[PDB]
Design a protein. Sequence first.
Lengths: 77, 75, 105, 105, 73, 156
Amino acid sequence: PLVTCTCESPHCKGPTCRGAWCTVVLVREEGRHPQEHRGCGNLHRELCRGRPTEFVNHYCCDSHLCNHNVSLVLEAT
Amino acid sequence: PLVTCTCESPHCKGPTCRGAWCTVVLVREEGRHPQEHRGCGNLHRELCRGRPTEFVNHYCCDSHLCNHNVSLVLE
Amino acid sequence: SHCQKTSLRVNFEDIGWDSWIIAPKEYEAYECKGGCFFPLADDVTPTKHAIVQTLVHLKFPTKVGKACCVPTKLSPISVLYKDDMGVPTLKYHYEGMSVAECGCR
Amino acid sequence: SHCQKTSLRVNFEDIGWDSWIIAPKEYEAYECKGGCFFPLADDVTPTKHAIVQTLVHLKFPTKVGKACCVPTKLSPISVLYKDDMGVPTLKYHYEGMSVAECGCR
Amino acid sequence: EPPQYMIDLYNRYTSDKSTTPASNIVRSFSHILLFNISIPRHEQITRAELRWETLEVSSAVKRWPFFVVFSND
Amino acid sequence: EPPQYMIDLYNRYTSDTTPASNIVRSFSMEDAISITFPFQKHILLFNISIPRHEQITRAELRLYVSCQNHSHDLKGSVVIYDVLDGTKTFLVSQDIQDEGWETLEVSSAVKRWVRSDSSKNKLEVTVESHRKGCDTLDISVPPRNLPFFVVFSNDH
Ligand SMILES: *[C@@H]1O[C@H](CO)[C@@H](O)[C@H](O)[C@H]1NC(C)=O
Ligand SMILES: *[C@@H]1O[C@H](CO)[C@@H](O)[C@H](O)[C@H]1NC(C)=O
């Protein structure tokens, strides 16, 4: 079972990819500006189960092109 | 069959080591002053067959404490 | 200043994995710090490509870079967690969690 | 600017190995350049420890460092050389000479 | 919240560091009633116990309030 | 300088077919002694040495036969014996059809040299000519195309 996902990321080779699930990840290093990537995931399902922090928001979904229009936030709190 | 070699290097734990052969290596980084090491060698004997360059002079020998008083040059 | 193993304590609350990891709360996963300076030591166990790239780097330091100090062997730990459905699962050998040895590659 | 495999042509005369290497005179031994920035790609094949250290690095960039982009698989080449005694030797699979794959470790 | 038997089995494995259990995976699924259980496809099941007492109900779990399952890759 | 045979063997390894021999070594000739009536005999001395953990798969002997005042069919023959004491031991007998290099398999002699459980590194080569297309012919001996050994081995 493979799913096609939206691919908006420097790691992308084309506008879509195929993988085990779809991901939208919003990362902020402590010193730098935040970045957002969209792509496929195949190896580390544990990242999907993690709670969002002030640095990373790792979102996953299992539908075809489910990662296209979803929006995420980051918060220092 | 292991041979005893002079050990003058930061990796040394004592004045001598035991290994398959003895080595004297002179390294010069492009920006820094050259450094000279004396110790044992065990893994890559091919380095011994190379000709010295302007950066590295890798000398090997198979005798007891043969690496003690030898001095090397670069270029 | 050379490739070696350093202590690093990982607290799962810091990375947000406390939501699904039940135990342990924190554990010791080491780190490989230090540089790969020629001549490369035996305990580092350098590969042939690492030596070649190092020798090439010495002539062209701006074009070619040095070898890197990375973990060359990983040890597993025991962990109790919850999967996607929430089932409490206990794995005796959660592989790839701790650094056993370092090296230059 | 991300972990990938780049071309690197090694000319044995530059490192002084032309004295004992008969053929080839130069060959393609690749290099792994680029950084390991979260999220780490799948083709990088990160380990569990690589993921943990990267997430911890995001919080403490000065105390903990990123995973390094290193060769994760090496391919052999055929070489004709002279041994210690000077015997012309030809090895079909001189292992560890060329980079097959890169990754973050 | 997980049962206290899963936590006790955890403390048994880490403390000795030499238990070396036969199966690396252990799961805990929560009159006559039933529960929804899912074991992975590639792994092979070792043991099943309906659990307080212990009942080796390994025969039923191959096809179809904390039952404990032992499995391995 | 390495023999051209090793270089050509390398170019054959690179061009596209999974060789059965992982290691190939080339041993040149150390000394040779000519013997002087019915034919032309030489005694060749080598110094073969192979690591014990490797297993020999093949051993060749490369010779160069020709004559002065040079048919595609001149009848010659090379016979080779393994020298032990002063007794010999038969190895091969090869008919010669034209001038140039010749490859003679002598695997059993090298195997006895490596696992030296019993003299070694010495063999006697005799060459005869028959027809009139070339009266006398012999191997090239040092006074250019000196003979050498080629050992094929695997690291098993
Ligand atoms: C268990 O229930 C979930 C939803 O509650 C369902 O998605 C899953 O398929 C069930 N398990 C099995 C083996 O069908
Ligand atoms: C000749 O063979 C002997 C072994 O019988 C060996 O010790 C010696 O090193 C060889 N000659 C040379 C020049 O290496």
